[PDB]
């Protein structure tokens, strides 16, 4: 019996920042977030008077518009002051006070598309060669080989960009939460990468503005407004953007498969919140790299025990198994990594419940397949509205039909 997935309106985006829909303004950098952000802004000349093109149905849309216009205005002030300050504390306007706070859903196709996008390779590297690991001593020879092979396959992976993006914004927000407790601080969303030719690049995805943050404990919430560039027209999948007000803010000139084209640039705005403990996990997202490697190392040490010989080279160079189901060893590494990253990006008690209880039903059907309710209500009580959980339930059902 397949799990019954819930009927209802399509599920909507709930990550802390854009994933496949993000857009970067970038520079080849010659280290202070706000200076880097302003230089990134200055690379774009297609800005225009912003307007709402997908309203937030439950929020105050004029306040989101006023908030983006305030960002541009206060950045314009910074540009007129002789020095550029290290940080920028927003005026406590009424639109920002409002925005900072002072049901069954069915599976939609977008979340699978997000996951496919996370597995892809980008044209830039997002981690250094020795990024993975915490070891006090030098690693032994086999451990080194395995980490180098693995890193070669995931260093350019889109899921790794999400890791580093996530690490940056969580560190910046958490640091601001105790260094500027009473300020509506403007926090640029930045990542850094290296192009195939070795050039260092600094990327701006947008900004967040934090609310008051007297975080007395791990579960105290700090609210924030995120404002994120995108080329995704929200009118194509409106259900995805239930939680957002979306602005059109510019026009960008692009190289494409039909030469130069001009496409509108959007700004995805929502209010959100996070806690000390979730920001600490966000700072730890590089462990996804380490957890994924360790799942690969289990597979290598299984083939190795059987062959009475270390199988690291034969595993990563694909030289007994007669193929790779996902098509390449590279795709297996990036698939494992994307699962770990999405578990972190989309963490929830629904995911936790689903993971524990679906594994129980897994082993039971495995033992029935090899040798021939209640647990179902436990799993299916986690199938409410979360895109990541619903997708994983959809995947589990394929593992059942097969
Ligand atoms: C209307 C609009 O959207 C707009 C956008 N810019 C670009 C800009 C703004 C602030 C900066 F600190 C750097 C660049 C300008 C000048 N107007």
UniProtKB/Swiss-Prot annotation:
Annotated GO biological process: cap snatching; DNA-templated transcription; negative regulation of viral genome replication; negative regulation of viral transcription; negative stranded viral RNA replication; protein import into nucleus; symbiont-mediated suppression of host gene expression; symbiont-mediated suppression of host mRNA transcription via inhibition of RNA polymerase II activity
Main location: host cell
EC number: 3.1.-.-
Entry note: cofactor: Binds 2 manganese ions per subunit.
Post-translational modification: Phosphorylated on serines and threonines by host kinases, including human casein kinase II.
Molecular function as annotated in GO: endonuclease activity; metal ion binding; RNA binding; RNA polymerase activity
Cofactor annotation: Mn(2+)
Keyword set, alphabetical order: Cap snatching, Endonuclease, Eukaryotic host gene expression shutoff by virus, Eukaryotic host transcription shutoff by virus, Host cytoplasm, Host gene expression shutoff by virus, Host nucleus, Host-virus interaction, Hydrolase, Inhibition of host RNA polymerase II by virus, Manganese, Metal-binding, Nuclease, Phosphoprotein
Localization in the cell: Host cytoplasm; Host nucleus
GO cellular component, as recorded: host cell cytoplasm; host cell nucleus
Family to which this protein belongs: Belongs to the influenza viruses PA family.
Record note on quaternary structure: Influenza RNA polymerase is composed of three subunits: PB1, PB2 and PA. Interacts (via C-terminus) with PB1 (via N-terminus).
Function: Plays an essential role in viral RNA transcription and replication by forming the heterotrimeric polymerase complex together with PB1 and PB2 subunits. The complex transcribes viral mRNAs by using a unique mechanism called cap-snatching. It consists in the hijacking and cleavage of host capped pre-mRNAs. These short capped RNAs are then used as primers for viral mRNAs. The PB2 subunit is responsible for the binding of the 5' cap of cellular pre-mRNAs which are subsequently cleaved after 10-13 nucleotides by the PA subunit that carries the endonuclease activity.
UniProt-recorded name of the protein: Polymerase acidic protein
Taxonomic lineage: Viruses, Riboviria, Orthornavirae, Negarnaviricota, Polyploviricotina
Shown chain mapped onto the complete sequence: 266 to 713 of 716
């Amino acid at each position: 019996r397949p799990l019954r997935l819930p009927d209802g309106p399509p599920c909507s985006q709930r990550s802390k920042f854009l994933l496949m829909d993000a857009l970067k303004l970038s520079i080849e950098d010659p280290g202070i977030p706000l200076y880097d952000a302003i230089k990134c802004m200055r690379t774009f000349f297609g800005w225009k008077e912003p307007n709402v093109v997908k309203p937030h149905e439950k929020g105050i849309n004029p306040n989101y518009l006023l908030s983006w216009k305030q960002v541009l205005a206060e950045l314009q002030d910074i540009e007129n002051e002789e020095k550029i300050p290290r940080t920028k504390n927003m005026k406590k306007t009424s639109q920002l006070k409002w925005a900072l706070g002072e049901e069954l859903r069915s599976l939609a196709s977008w979340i699978q598309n997000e996951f496919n996008k996370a597995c892809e390779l980008t044209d830039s590297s997002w981690i250094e060669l020795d990024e993975i690991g915490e070891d006090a001593a030098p690693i032994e020879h086999i451990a080194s080989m395995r980490r180098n092979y693995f890193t070669a396959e995931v260093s350019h992976c889109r899921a790794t960009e999400y890791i580093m993006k996530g690490v940056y914004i969580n560190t910046a927000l958490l640091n601001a939460s105790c260094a500027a407790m009473d300020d509506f601080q403007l926090i640029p969303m930045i990542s850094k990468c290296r192009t195939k030719e070795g050039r260092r690049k600094t990327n701006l995805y947008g900004f967040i503005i934090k609310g008051r943050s007297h975080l007395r404990n791990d579960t105290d919430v700090v609210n924030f407004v995120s404002m994120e560039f995108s080329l995704t027209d929200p009118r194509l999948e409106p259900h995805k953007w239930e939680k957002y007000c979306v602005l059109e803010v510019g026009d960008m000139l692009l190289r494409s498969a039909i030469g130069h084209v001009s496409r509108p640039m959007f700004l995805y705005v929502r209010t959100n919140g996070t806690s000390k403990i979730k920001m600490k996990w966000g700072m730890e997202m590089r462990r996804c790299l380490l957890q994924s490697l360790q799942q690969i190392e289990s597979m290598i040490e299984a083939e190795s025990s059987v062959k009475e010989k270390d199988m690291t080279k034969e595993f990563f160079e694909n030289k007994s198994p007669k193929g790779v189901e996902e098509g390449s060893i590279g795709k297996v590494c990036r698939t494992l990594l994307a699962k770990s990253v999405f578990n972190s990006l989309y963490a929830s008690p629904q995911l936790e419940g689903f993971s524990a209880e679906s594994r129980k039903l897994l082993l039971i059907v495995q033992a029935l397949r090899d040798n021939l309710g209640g647990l179902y209500e436990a799993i299916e009580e986690c199938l409410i509205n979360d895109p990541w959980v619903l997708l994983n339930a959809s995947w589990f059902n394929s593992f059942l039909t097969h």
